[PDB]
């Protein structure tokens, strides 16, 4: 199997070499990355310009950083391969991706959505932290991270996506513990509520901040595990937009068992650190 | 009823300022949109940092500019009205909008994407163009775009969106003539092929060109009536991405009538046009 890795913080994330690390036991990896983050890169297909692609050394591997958006990534990825790749892995995102607000406007989701788009598997990982060291010294935290990592990613490899879901998103709470598991849920409409700070620069002119405040989450929702249950949140999205398209068809029994397939490696993983610190 | 106009190819864009006076005789009319273009102009929320809003005189009428994204448009107006708009207008993009590959990267869909996250009714605008100079001497194009947009808007300001749909984004084709009618389509799943093109610039450093190529659509896409048919396509799009909702209701009489009522309004048109 081939397998495209990517994100959109910046080739040089802590958090790709983790997804990088985690897929290498799948297949061939190969990683190519947006050189800035993507508070520097839009979203979206870039038709205004020519991208550049170069090699970068993340210290143990390589990878190839480019010029353009995350949206961009599949497209100059396949043709720097040759042909299409049969998975793409978006993420270790640095930061929660959770509800259509946040997801519509994520660059961790937006390469998900071309590949999928493209007809390839594809599947973004996400984490609720502020920081990596607190993840990076937990050595447990980043087993159990690359358990879930590994099993959605191979359950897809092995049984394709489940009919009806183009991109599957995978949100990691903020403490990554031996008992936690995971669950399969809706994303949120909102995450952030739309109250706005309005403040004045040191020159007396006005600047405003959005989205401070978090709305409350409710059960069921991915804001609601991640934030308030401390699980990981598995939720399944389609790229079909097209509202005459009304009565849809998922199977939602594969979900399950992929679900499934990732709890009990998390038990067969907590069973194993034991007996080893026992 | 409140409007709010906006794009997301600049505050300076023609295509803002036809959008603002098709608009005006529907209502009260606010026009609030990113300086620069999107293509300096991420999309997405903006977190990274605070946003600045400015009066600009457009000349003909002001214009509040923002330094930030599409996304953040309805965000900061809603703000600055102290109340939710009754609908969000967004466009007379440059440039087609069909196909998901490109709604799901547009700032023109974005803008209307974050109007109906909210709760509020929206639609965008997006003309096959190379440019604006055709068009804006062409009076008879001018007014037919005007009646579409304006039969689109007040038939969801006097009976709502269609349950069910979150944006209707309306593409006009290139050429925009008496006989030109509107068709409910889909949109297709993608507008570019994936081929890459490969240069090499004077340095001998390569560079690539992306998405040069147009795929061939198929019929009863929003691609194919804009491209091949030079129909204009009206298109219902619903933001609900959670794979697990598979029975979903859509008010699909309504959309008909809809579209009926723009293919009314510009039959009367041709008529009068015709210095009946």
């Not at 519509?104 to 990982?125: E, H, R, V």
């Not at 008992?179 to 403040?199: H, P």
């Amino acid at each position: 199997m081939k397998i495209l890795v990517t994100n959109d913080d910046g080739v040089h994330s802590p958090g790709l070499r983790l997804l990088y690390q985690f897929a290498l036991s799948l297949g061939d990896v190969d990683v190519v990355a947006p050189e800035s983050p993507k508070s520097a890169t839009g979203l979206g297909i870039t038709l205004h310009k020519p991208l550049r692609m170069y090699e970068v050394d993340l210290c143990g591997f390589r990878a190839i950083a480019t010029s353009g958006t995350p949206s961009d990534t599949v497209y100059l990825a396949t043709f720097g391969l040759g042909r299409k790749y049969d998975i793409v892995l978006s993420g270790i995102n640095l930061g929660d991706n959770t509800s259509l607000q946040v997801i519509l406007s994520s660059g961790t989701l937006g390469a998900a959505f071309q590949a999928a788009l493209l007809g390839i598997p594809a599947l973004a990982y996400s984490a609720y932290l502020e920081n990596w060291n607190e993840l990076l010294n937990n050595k447990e935290a980043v087993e159990i991270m690359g358990a879930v990592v590994s099993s959605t990613a191979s359950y897809v490899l092995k049984n394709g996506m489940p009919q009806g879901v183009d991109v599957i998103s995978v949100n990691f709470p903020r403490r990554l513990g031996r008992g936690v598991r995971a669950k399969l849920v809706k994303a949120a409409k909102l995450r952030y509520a739309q109250q706005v700070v309005e403040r004045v620069d040191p020159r007396g002119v006005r600047y405003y901040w959005l989205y401070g405040r978090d709305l409350a989450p409710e059960p069921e929702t991915d804001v609601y595990v991640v934030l308030k249950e401390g699980g990981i949140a598995i939720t399944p999205l389609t790229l079909n937009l097209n509202a005459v398209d009304a009565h849809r068809e998922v199977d939602m029994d594969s979900l399950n068992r992929m679900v499934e397939y990732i709890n009990a490696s998390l038990s067969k993983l907590a069973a194993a650190l034991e007996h080893h610190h026992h």
